[PDB]
């Protein structure tokens, strides 16, 4: 039979059968209970709208993501999300399909063990396998080397790989991602008068960020230009009218990636953690990693980031090496495409964690040889 | 049929059919297992890359030479190296070709006996013969007398020969060679800030030594000059950028040959063990040995060694004798060229150790008349 390539993610759940080009169903991972009282009788009001249904009734819900930073903080809601994904968005019972979840690097063990225990006890799948979210993004590019920066919505991690041999001592995981950029944008919009507070209006700020923000090639020059002319002010129409005008908030929101001091984080930007991740590698594979830097994940879709990052790394790196940044147009679904490719391989067909194996060793089987 | 003139060496395996000018395939003798985990499935990852293949994937391997000082310390790896040499670099099955290995003087017997046992049982050659690495280097020079200093990469030995009669009591074998010079260079580079530790970076230090180091004609004057001017500082680009500048480390690394007290060895340099080897000979053949001093082996390729050695010996020797140092441009492959010449001789065709002879007397046949 065919395998189910699910990809929990944090912000958008992407799923679909193995062997295709794009995920079949992509929908936000939010579960929102209603918060008001409700007076109409017999309206058929449910107790929790999940997935894309709660992005249409969000006016009277309190949306809450079940995955904070890679890790899962609310297991009941995550179980509800998985149940919805299997039964309503794909309509395939899990009793007859292997599953291939994905997990960020350096995550707590208990999260992974609970994930496999749920998949084997509640949904009762035949066999499931957990894979690191960066190796798949490297599969999708058709490479076999390269250092991949997978800046998702929950957590940004940077896994270097050479000739198929991952370097476990050079993984640099940073917890700045799309959600923190949304919060920072929502916080700097208040400088013009627009106040978004409700958890429903966070979605509106996210839409503003997606449609308007861009990464500046040079930050100081843009700050000077936006403060003199008015060629940058782009307007946007809220879900009820009252258009708003975003000035130099456009390139200040995604600039947080390269200067995490804006949101008070100490660490260095995504332009310098990649160079540090390279320098921890051996001295003989640094040229190949320099030449095959891969971008993935949703948050790396800002217009103009593949040039800013290249300029920064070229500034840091030695002058002789060639710096090349692979930015495929299908960046958002790169991890899932790689997952489909991996699940479609014949050599991989014996790596699944078969159910009888789980019955013999318990949930701690995932840390064992079947990784 | 044609004979296979293999030459194990220590650092570079040189092989080729008898009767040519240069070895057909020359490649480092290193076998490196991968050390990281490996996440890509179906990449076709082997368990051990040998020869020149492991000098390209050395970023994720742990290279380890199977020959320490002439002697062989890891027989399985040496067998693997031989198998590679026969089947992939020459593509001739050994069942139809005599072989002519080479061995340093004064080596343990068990090494030679195991070598012949392997060649007769595993590879199943028709007949093999083991020859001393210095007599061949004397063949290649077209001489018949002379004292040859064969400073390889494993061990430096100094065999005097007169009129074809070797003098077994005057062989002076010293264990300082190219590998110790590589280690000492890697140890003195730390005085400027460059730290090379990994077994892969030993190859980079070896490349630095080959391309930059030279032997000073007079040591104290060079030490004084390099400490005042800056006309010696030559720069070199690592495999990833970050050029380095070598100062007076240039002529201090190969100076260890003439002052083995630098690496803590007690013995005298290669300039004085040759004179001692001569003085052990009879009083009537010392003039001929003085006039026909032969250099061979890789490590004697330093720019300016044929003058330093001549100056030193002229200082030691009596003033009347003429000191001449033969330094052919084809120094590195001198032993193999001599091996080809010896294997191509008609008079030598009945000295091979035929397989039926080995079957009758066991591996201890090599010490017998068929030397």
């Amino acid at each position: 039979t065919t395998a189910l390539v699910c990809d929990n993610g944090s912000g958008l759940v992407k799923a679909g059968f193995a062997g295709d080009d794009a995920p079949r169903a992509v929908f936000p991972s939010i579960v929102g209970r209603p918060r008001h009282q409700g007076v109409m009788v017999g309206m058929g009001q449910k107790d929790s709208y999940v997935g894309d249904e709660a992005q249409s009734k969000r006016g009277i819900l309190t949306l809450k993501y079940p995955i904070e930073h890679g890790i899962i903080t609310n297991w009941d809601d995550m179980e509800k999300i998985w149940h919805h994904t299997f039964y309503n968005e794909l309509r395939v019972a899990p009793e007859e399909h292997p599953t291939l979840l994905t997990e960020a690097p350096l995550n707590p063990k208990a999260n992974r063990e609970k994930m496999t225990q749920i998949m084997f006890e509640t949904f009762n799948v035949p066999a499931m396998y957990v894979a690191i979210q960066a190796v798949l993004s490297l599969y999708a590019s058709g490479r076999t080397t390269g250092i991949v920066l997978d800046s998702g919505d929950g957590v940004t991690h940077n896994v270097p790989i050479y000739e198929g041999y991952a370097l476990p001592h050079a993984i640099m995981r940073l917890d700045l991602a799309g959600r923190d950029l949304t919060d920072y944008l929502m916080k700097i919009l208040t400088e013009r008068g627009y106040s978004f507070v409700t958890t429903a209006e966070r979605e509106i700020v996210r839409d503003i960020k997606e449609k308007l923000c861009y990464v500046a090639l040079d930050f100081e020059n843009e700050m000077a230009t936006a403060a003199s002319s008015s060629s940058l002010e782009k307007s946007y129409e809220l879900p009820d009218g009252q258009v708003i005008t975003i000035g130099n908030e456009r390139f200040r929101c995604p600039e947080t990636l390269f200067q995490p001091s804006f949101i008070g984080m100490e660490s260095a930007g995504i332009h310098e953690t990649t160079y540090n991740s390279i320098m921890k590698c051996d001295i003989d594979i640094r040229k190949d990693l320099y030449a095959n830097n891969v971008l993935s994940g949703g948050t790396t879709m800002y217009p103009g980031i593949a040039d800013r990052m290249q300029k920064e790394i070229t500034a840091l790196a030695p002058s002789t090496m060639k710096i090349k940044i692979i930015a495929p147009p299908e960046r958002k679904y790169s991890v899932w495409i790689g997952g489909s490719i991996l699940a479609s391989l014949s050599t991989f067909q014996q790596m699944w964690i078969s159910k009888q194996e789980y019955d013999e060793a318990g949930p701690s089987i995932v840390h064992r040889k079947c990784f | 049929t044609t004979a296979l003139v293999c030459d194990n060496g220590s650092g570079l395996v040189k092989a080729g059919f008898a009767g040519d000018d240069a070895p057909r395939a020359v490649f480092p003798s290193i076998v490196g297992r991968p050390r990281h985990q490996g996440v890509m499935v179906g990449m076709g990852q082997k368990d051990s890359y040998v020869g020149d293949e492991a000098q390209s994937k050395r970023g994720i391997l742990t290279l380890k030479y199977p020959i320490e000082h002439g002697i062989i310390t890891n027989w399985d790896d040496m067998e693997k190296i031989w198998h590679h040499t026969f089947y992939n670099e020459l593509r001739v099955a050994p069942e139809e070709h005599p072989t002519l290995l080479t061995e340093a003087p004064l080596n343990p017997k068990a090494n030679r006996e195991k070598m012949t046992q392997i060649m007769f049982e595993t590879f199943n050659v028709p007949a093999m013969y083991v020859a001393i690495q210095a007599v061949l280097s004397l063949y290649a020079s077209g001489r018949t007398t002379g004292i040859v200093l064969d400073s390889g990469d494993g061990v430096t030995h100094n065999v005097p020969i007169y009129e074809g009669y070797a003098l077994p009591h005057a062989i002076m074998r010293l264990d300082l060679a190219g590998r110790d010079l590589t280690d000492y260079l890697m140890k003195i580079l730390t005085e400027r800030g460059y730290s090379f530790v990994t077994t892969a970076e030993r190859e980079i230090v070896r490349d630095i030594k080959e391309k930059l180091c030279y032997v000073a004609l007079d040591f104290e004057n060079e030490m004084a000059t390099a400490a005042s001017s800056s006309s010696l500082e030559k720069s070199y680009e690592l495999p990833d950028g970050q050029v380095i500048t070598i100062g007076n480390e240039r002529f201090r690394c190969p100076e260890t040959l003439f002052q083995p007290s630098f690496i803590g060895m007690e013995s005298a340099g290669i300039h004085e063990t040759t004179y001692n080897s001569i003085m052990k000979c009879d009083i009537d053949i010392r003039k001929d040995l003085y006039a026909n001093n032969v250099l061979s082996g890789g490590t004697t390729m330093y720019p300016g060694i044929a003058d330093r050695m001549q100056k030193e010996i002229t200082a030691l020797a009596p003033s009347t004798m003429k000191i001449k140092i033969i330094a052919p441009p084809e120094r590195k492959y001198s032993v193999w060229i001599g091996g080809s010449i010896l294997a191509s001789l008609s008079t030598f065709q009945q000295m091979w150790i035929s397989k039926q002879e080995y079957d009758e007397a066991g591996p201890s046949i090599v010490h017998r008349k068929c030397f």
Partner: peptide, 20 residues
């Protein structure tokens, strides 16, 4: 110990043509 992937045959970077 870290997992050990069994050795296969082929391929990679050859499906980029057939999917692009």
């Amino acid at each position: 110990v870290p997992p050990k992937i069994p050795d296969g045959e082929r391929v990679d970077f050859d499906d980029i043509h057939r999917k692009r």
